[PDB]
Amino acid sequence: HIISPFNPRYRAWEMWLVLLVIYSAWICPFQFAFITYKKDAIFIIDNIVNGFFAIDIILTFFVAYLDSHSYLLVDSPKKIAIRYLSTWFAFDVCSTAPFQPLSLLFNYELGFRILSMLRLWRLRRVSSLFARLEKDIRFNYFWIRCTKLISVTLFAIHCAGCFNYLIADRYPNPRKTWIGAVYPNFKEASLWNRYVTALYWSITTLTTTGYGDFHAENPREMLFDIFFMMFNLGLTAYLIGNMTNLVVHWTSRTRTFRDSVRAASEFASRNQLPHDIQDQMLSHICLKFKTEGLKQQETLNNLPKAIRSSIANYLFFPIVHNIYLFQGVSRNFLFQLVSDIDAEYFPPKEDIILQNEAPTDLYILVSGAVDFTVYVDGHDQFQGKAVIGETFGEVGVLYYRPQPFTVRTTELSQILRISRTSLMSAMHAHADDGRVIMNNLFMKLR
Amino acid sequence: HIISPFNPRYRAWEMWLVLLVIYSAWICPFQFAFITYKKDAIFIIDNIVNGFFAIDIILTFFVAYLDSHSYLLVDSPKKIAIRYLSTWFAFDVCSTAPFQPLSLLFNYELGFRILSMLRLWRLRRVSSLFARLEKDIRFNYFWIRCTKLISVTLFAIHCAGCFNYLIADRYPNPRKTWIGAVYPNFKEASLWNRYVTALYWSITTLTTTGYGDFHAENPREMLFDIFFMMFNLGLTAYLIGNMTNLVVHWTSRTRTFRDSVRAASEFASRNQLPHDIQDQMLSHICLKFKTEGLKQQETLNNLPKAIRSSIANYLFFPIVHNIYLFQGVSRNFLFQLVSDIDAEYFPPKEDIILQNEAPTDLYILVSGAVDFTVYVDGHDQFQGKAVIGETFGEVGVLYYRPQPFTVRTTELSQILRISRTSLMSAMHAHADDGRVIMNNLFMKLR
Amino acid sequence: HIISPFNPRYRAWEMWLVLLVIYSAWICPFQFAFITYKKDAIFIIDNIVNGFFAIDIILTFFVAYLDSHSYLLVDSPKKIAIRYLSTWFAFDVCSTAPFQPLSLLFNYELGFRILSMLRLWRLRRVSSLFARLEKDIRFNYFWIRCTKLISVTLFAIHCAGCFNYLIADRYPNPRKTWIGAVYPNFKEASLWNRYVTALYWSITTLTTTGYGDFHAENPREMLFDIFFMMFNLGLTAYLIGNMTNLVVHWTSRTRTFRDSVRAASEFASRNQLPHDIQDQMLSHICLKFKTEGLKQQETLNNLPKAIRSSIANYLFFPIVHNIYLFQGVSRNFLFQLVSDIDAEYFPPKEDIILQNEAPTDLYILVSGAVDFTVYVDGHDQFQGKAVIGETFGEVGVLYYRPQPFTVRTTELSQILRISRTSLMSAMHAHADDGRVIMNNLFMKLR
Amino acid sequence: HIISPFNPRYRAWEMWLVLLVIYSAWICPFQFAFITYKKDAIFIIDNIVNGFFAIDIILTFFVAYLDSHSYLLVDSPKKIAIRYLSTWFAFDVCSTAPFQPLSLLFNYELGFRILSMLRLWRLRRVSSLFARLEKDIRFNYFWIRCTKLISVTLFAIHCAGCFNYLIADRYPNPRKTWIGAVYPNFKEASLWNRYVTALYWSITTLTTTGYGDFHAENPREMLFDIFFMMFNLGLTAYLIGNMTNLVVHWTSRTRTFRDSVRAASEFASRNQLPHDIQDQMLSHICLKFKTEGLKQQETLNNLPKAIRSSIANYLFFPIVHNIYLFQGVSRNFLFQLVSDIDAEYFPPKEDIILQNEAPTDLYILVSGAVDFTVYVDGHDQFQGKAVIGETFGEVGVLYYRPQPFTVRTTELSQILRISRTSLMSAMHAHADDGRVIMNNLFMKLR
Ligand SMILES: CCCCCCCCCCCCCC(=O)O[C@@H](COC(=O)CCCCCCCC)COP(=O)(O)O
Ligand SMILES: CCCCCCCCCCCCCC(=O)O[C@@H](COC(=O)CCCCCCCC)COP(=O)(O)O
Ligand SMILES: CCCCCCCCCCCCCC(=O)O[C@@H](COC(=O)CCCCCCCC)COP(=O)(O)O
Numbered sequence A, B, C, D: 001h002i003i004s005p006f007n008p009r010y011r012a013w014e015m016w017l018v019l020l021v022i023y024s025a026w027i028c029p030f031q032f033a034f035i036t037y038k039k040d041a042i043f044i045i046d047n048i049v050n051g052f053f054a055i056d057i058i059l060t061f062f063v064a065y066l067d068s069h070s071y072l073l074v075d076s077p078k079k080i081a082i083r084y085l086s087t088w089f090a091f092d093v094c095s096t097a098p099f100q101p102l103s104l105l106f107n108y109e110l111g112f113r114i115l116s117m118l119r120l121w122r123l124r125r126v127s128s129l130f131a132r133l134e135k136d137i138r139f140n141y142f143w144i145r146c147t148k149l150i151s152v153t154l155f156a157i158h159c160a161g162c163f164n165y166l167i168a169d170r171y172p173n174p175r176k177t178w179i180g181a182v183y184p185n186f187k188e189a190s191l192w193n194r195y196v197t198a199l200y201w202s203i204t205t206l207t208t209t210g211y212g213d214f215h216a217e218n219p220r221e222m223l224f225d226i227f228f229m230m231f232n233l234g235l236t237a238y239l240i241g242n243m244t245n246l247v248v249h250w251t252s253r254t255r256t257f258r259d260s261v262r263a264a265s266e267f268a269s270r271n272q273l274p275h276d277i278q279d280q281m282l283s284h285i286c287l288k289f290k291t292e293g294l295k296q297q298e299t300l301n302n303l304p305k306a307i308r309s310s311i312a313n314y315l316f317f318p319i320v321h322n323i324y325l326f327q328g329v330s331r332n333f334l335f336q337l338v339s340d341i342d343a344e345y346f347p348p349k350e351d352i353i354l355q356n357e358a359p360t361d362l363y364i365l366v367s368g369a370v371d372f373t374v375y376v377d378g379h380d381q382f383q384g385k386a387v388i389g390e391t392f393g394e395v396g397v398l399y400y401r402p403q404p405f406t407v408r409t410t411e412l413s414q415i416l417r418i419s420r421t422s423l424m425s426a427m428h429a430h431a432d433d434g435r436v437i438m439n440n441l442f443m444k445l446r
């Protein structure tokens, strides 16, 4: 018996009202200044529009809302009328109520047009849409906000141009007005010439060009220009502020990358490192930026540490499920195993593990070739290998001994890292470490 | 015997002085240029205003202040005169002292008007108010500062317009001035036409429009325009800077939210997660933003860790006071218990606790339904439940064993979390853990 | 059989195309408005340019690209045509296709010039270059982006000026146009005068000056100015946003330094420290800023903790290799030793180690003199020394006893710091600590 | 034999050169356009200025500099000539060399004035001063940078005005120039009228007003305005960027404070806390902001942890030196004791320690009254006290028992905090804890 605020009916009703509001807001100054009122072909359409909003006044009592403290619903139509009658009812029933149609049919005009300028309270619904669409996900945020600013700027042009043409009509002596002193016969021309002339006056003093045509002579008009140029100063400052937000935010990523590269280059050229350490640092920052892992670190560390477990369970479980070491290790162990795996990504020709380094982490390959050569003991050649899926670092499992070989990449790779302390934290989950240790003993003895 | 600076008398005295300062600052250029001086109907009011400030000069010796290093008072009127006589006394006694009324009554004028332009030192009190109202809590900060800028801009318009009308009066050959070459008979017109014309000239070169009327011909006036247009360049840059602060600060929250959603969507569409993990991540960020917990985390972690204990004592003590487990647990234990409770809030249909997960935390419901179904062992149906107030996670109290069921939400909930390490930290507070363990044994055996 | 996208041939082919695109984009409005078409001396060059792009349409099928998910290559020409035929093929084959040369040779003009305005789709390659050069390392980032903005601004001036000269030619009554009412005989003048006049009109309404010459009289031209001044408002806001990024980013370092100095001075002058502690704090921040160690800390702590080991191995191994203590300590121990050394840098006259201070760290000198004097027990003189390479702090190795002397610098120095906990972490690497302890015993006994 | 770069002689020599550079840069356009050259009264002064710079060319070989990698000196005049002859020698010896005085005395002019426009290379010294004064401590940073921008803007006005007056002189037909068509007789007027007219033209198109006088008619002049208005667009954007930095940086502190208060008020009014917890949170943030402890925390935690020990040794040693507990505790213990003391500051009426709270920290008063009342057991009245210097919290030294009383402030205080873990860390420093424990036993037994 109560209409939910997420039906397909009510949302299409709102968007039909939004098109109707845009119609009313475009007509109202153009009706206020140029055209007369006694003819009725637009009077019909205005009365129909007032009928639609009078229907909406009734129908907003049947609609549920979303409360702030308790969520997802408010029903039982008490407190709905308390919400609607306190916040938005008074100005809506002032705006919806016809006054010109009663003045026309009762006895009878300028004081009745000002009562028709209250139709602009209907323009809150466009603000409610541009509040919804920023916060909705499935839209470009830097498109909606510039659309909002273009809407406000175009409406300011329109309303100011029509009001100045009004104050040019109502004044005796057509000469010494802004349009009279240039065109001496202007009331006999069409609507398109007068409307384009008023619009052209208004935009040359909004966008602060100000050629020198169409300046003011009438002192009341000379008074209107003071308030309009104050308003244009304020709005132009606001517009430059929004475009500064769009430019600062659109290019933050590339600027932060170039900061990191400048800092690495100053640190390198200060201490005079030869070539190799420079190329390692700069290529490693280039491949941190091509796979943008900084936002990955932040947004993974903002997750509630169970959804990241389901992420790693999707990504790395069939890779860890088939290794040299792990054979029969009881997948209910693997669910608690997988969730601490921290992926990584590595440049080519970066010496990963050097000879006689004290061990720190397991390096499961997921892709990419690896080339191992003797370091210090062997001047050149020798042997060293590992292929997709084939782990290494299995010396420092429990042997606690340094790595035999050198580890230099050939083509780029993706290397998982279950480190030493993570392994020793996995040690207390016993009765399945026996299978791992049997795989170690039968692994190395063969 | 010494007036405190927080009386209701002295604050109303200051605000009466602020209205008097605004009066003096509006009159002084308008008196300096347009009107004469020999008539006395405003001379009376100016002498009365000088009387009020001469009273304030005496009365500021009886008032205490707030020192910088030691707080809350300085009394004993030594060092009050040392403060007042060193900082603000000289220019105040130069500004308050009448010079035109002595020139009028002594013997007698342009050199005496410049001595009346020193009345603008009285305008420090408006700066003191706009320093107080930013730092006071009970006002909108983005309203006060724009009011300050509108005040400075309007006063610049006013003073520049009146000074240019002065330099147009004092020059012989009324033609070849800015107002003379357009209106040849301008000294015979009223005050309102000349004042609106001067104001209209001034605003078309402050807001950089510059139509082309009212340009300068007199070379001293052509010299005045150089300094005024330098000043307008500086002030327009300052105004755009302040509106950039208001726009960058007004929309930081929505922009940060949309950053987080873009980063989550790039991380999802890079690694090709199917649907479910995307919808979990995006709905969890949407319900971190509807209940803005990031500012909550920051401002709770900036608190001195006793007021947050009183906060949690108000919020969660009658909820934890009535549980399945806790029955007679000696509320002086509960005061030390409650202060480490970390609240949280959760989306619907997010699988909270999965089957055979190694346990981490207690999950006391505060609201919201919970639905538990068999995971892996059971393909569908089965049973699992918990209602408002009914805790779960009571397996991993001391049993250290994985959870039996799956835990999926149905409608959204608020779930407290006293985690495993927090429980084991609460273990050393003994002689009341016996009641908890008896409640465990009689709880599970039934 | 497939051309790689990193050959020297294909890159020079692209840059030749970029010069050809700049040629076409400069000619096309200037051809559209000023000159005729029936003569053929430029028609030849345009057909040759269309030939070059028709060659490029074929040749872009033989070129490999870089995929997003898997890196470094895509070969095997399937999916290359799927990439190229879906993204960029349609507008390229619309732009490359000649239509004016077919209109000239088939039967025959304004509707055929608009088909020649589609040559501006060729201007995507300039956007691809200005996307590459920001992300490439070996270029100044704040030079490329301002070059991009100057390019867009100059092209807007050019195209708007030529389009307004077109709409001034095509209109009957040469008077009441923008160039007709000032120059009554303008079609008989040269190209340079008309082109400079159109360019001069366009820039006085792009850069919002607007003298007052050359305003519009024709109502269709009065309509064109509305769209052009809207566009200029948008572009001027965008340009101010980019220069705000350049100014905020160019002076962040000096502003952060001056923040730190202001905060230290307020903390000093609040609590009334005499002189010495002020000069120590301020000189220490000055020598943190002359050797900018903050970016060093950040970018070293962002490194993957093996490249920083190779850095410290290059920088400090021949310094630690020759000390009082270390003599025969088996350089495979030294590789694991060096990587935890944290360098530092110190001001002169800063009291480094005071008398009877509980010990915290080893202080190996690398440069700079050190002067030690008796503290408290000795009023003045006494003795204390250490020279380049000569360590101190060797009391608190295992003796766990306070330092004997005071340590005040004379000229500035660079002092390594292997702290107490780092030494005790190095203790478990035994069978070579015996040599260190023998060097201690024979060191102190002599 | 080598002049140090920090003598009082050489710095005064540099500042005399800076005044001479400002003289040359102001004269050079004004000499280039307005005045003739054959008279000699300024020719003398120019030759003298060239003599001063020819002396400086020699004298810059005797001066030491500061190297980048090794600091504080470079002597031994090899590599000084390598620095000076590579970087700055060529353009200095091109600028210093006279060419007009040789043209005047050799045989003989426009091509020789362009050789005199190379005197503007001498203007690097003003850039070196405005690089030094930002980085020097004893100057306001937001004053120097705005002075730099005003200097560049005024010089742009000056040079552009004089160059346009040159291109107005050199053209035949004095009518159809910018100054000719308004003043038909302008070459017969003085210097002040022509100079003010050129300056007034230049500033109305720098500050984008553009009245409508003084527009261009000569096509070469119409070409000059294009480059000058491009330059003014660029410089106006740069100026707005710098004022945006000054406004964003000048009001960051108050804006951050108001952020914290808005976040606390939203967190309070969301969860509906009654009054008391709101007033505690808001008054505690107000007294974190009146004594700005956030910058204190940052800049103390950036200190090298020995200077902060000397700070706490100056601030708190004679306060801790005289307590209830500590009597004879051997001040060489006190030097290691004091350095971990963390000061704090507290609002009035904030309940500091509640009844039956599990203890956390010692609370030595340094000022401010304290009022203790019974909590829960006692409804009202009771007793509780502590005065300046009199510690409390001495229950939980080793008794590990909750506090007896409640602790509510009356007037604001400053309370040191040596916490529980800091005390237990001080426990291993024995052979003087016996005196503390004797003071405990004789303290409580009395
Ligand atoms: C041709 C006819 C077209 C008709 C269709 C157009 C009608 C659309 C109408 C939408 C209106 C809602 C837009 C809104 O809500 O107003 C923004 C605020 O506007 C300002 O800047 C006002 C600064 C004033 C300048 C100071 C005055 C100086 C004294 C919110 O911006 P926010 O900060 O994002 O909330
Ligand atoms: C019609 C009559 C109305 C009379 C009533 C109005 C009187 C009110 C009067 C209030 C005055 C106090 C306002 C203040 O204090 O001046 C701000 C600073 O102003 C600037 O920008 C000055 C930039 C100059 C431009 C460089 C010059 C270029 C060479 C502080 O701003 P802050 O940074 O927030 O402190
Ligand atoms: C004399 C002849 C010279 C011919 C050579 C010049 C041709 C070069 C041509 C390069 C073009 C690529 C440059 C680009 O891509 O367009 C930037 C975006 O431009 C804007 O600002 C457009 C704002 C519109 C204002 C709103 C309109 C208001 C309704 C990207 O900027 P981004 O943000 O960095 O990506």
Ligand SMILES: CCCCCCCCCCCCCC(=O)O[C@@H](COC(=O)CCCCCCCC)COP(=O)(O)O
Binding pocket: C250, D022, D025, D026, D123, D126, D127, D148, D151, D152, D154, D155, D158, D230, D231, D234, D235, D238
């Ligand atoms: C009346 C006679 C007075 C004579 C005395 C004055 C002589 C002083 C002369 C000082 C000069 C050094 C100042 C400097 O170095 O130039 C700043 C940079 O200037 C710009 O903005 C240039 C933007 C160009 C706009 C793009 C052009 C668009 C195509 C550094 O600013 P920075 O970023 O802080 O380094």
Ligand SMILES: CC(C)CCC[C@@H](C)[C@H]1CC[C@H]2[C@@H]3CC[C@@H]4C[C@@H](O)CC[C@]4(C)[C@H]3CC[C@]12C
Binding pocket: A120, A121, A123, A124, A127, A152, A155, A156, A157, A159, A160, A228, A231
């Ligand atoms: C002189 C002339 C330029 C005046 C134009 C000013 C407009 C910018 C004014 C006229 C009516 C105003 C609208 C009417 C009230 C609206 C409801 C409010 O919840 C949001 C702002 C809201 C949408 C206003 C925005 C600003 C408007 C559109």
Ligand SMILES: CC(C)CCC[C@@H](C)[C@H]1CC[C@H]2[C@@H]3CC[C@@H]4C[C@@H](O)CC[C@]4(C)[C@H]3CC[C@]12C
Binding pocket: B120, B121, B123, B124, B127, B152, B155, B156, B157, B159, B160, B228, B231
């Ligand atoms: C050419 C014309 C535009 C000059 C107007 C400049 C004004 C903006 C000047 C004139 C007098 C100045 C005021 C007088 C001194 C005031 C005391 C000081 O503690 C705060 C600034 C303070 C309030 C000044 C602000 C700027 C004012 C109001």
Ligand SMILES: CC(C)CCC[C@@H](C)[C@H]1CC[C@H]2[C@@H]3CC[C@@H]4C[C@@H](O)CC[C@]4(C)[C@H]3CC[C@]12C
Binding pocket: C120, C121, C123, C124, C127, C152, C155, C156, C157, C159, C160, C228, C231
């Ligand atoms: C009224 C007149 C000023 C219009 C000029 C507008 C120009 C600024 C428009 C005209 C053609 C447009 C270009 C054509 C399409 C181009 C491909 C796109 O991938 C990047 C933008 C891209 C390069 C456009 C940038 C903006 C241009 C250059």
Ligand SMILES: CC(C)CCC[C@@H](C)[C@H]1CC[C@H]2[C@@H]3CC[C@@H]4C[C@@H](O)CC[C@]4(C)[C@H]3CC[C@]12C
Binding pocket: D120, D121, D123, D124, D127, D152, D155, D156, D157, D159, D160, D228, D231
């Ligand atoms: C059209 C007219 C407005 C041209 C004026 C442009 C000036 C802004 C140019 C003219 C000469 C230029 C100066 C000459 C070279 C100087 C050395 C360099 O290390 C710092 C910039 C440096 C100081 C330049 C700054 C910009 C100046 C002062």
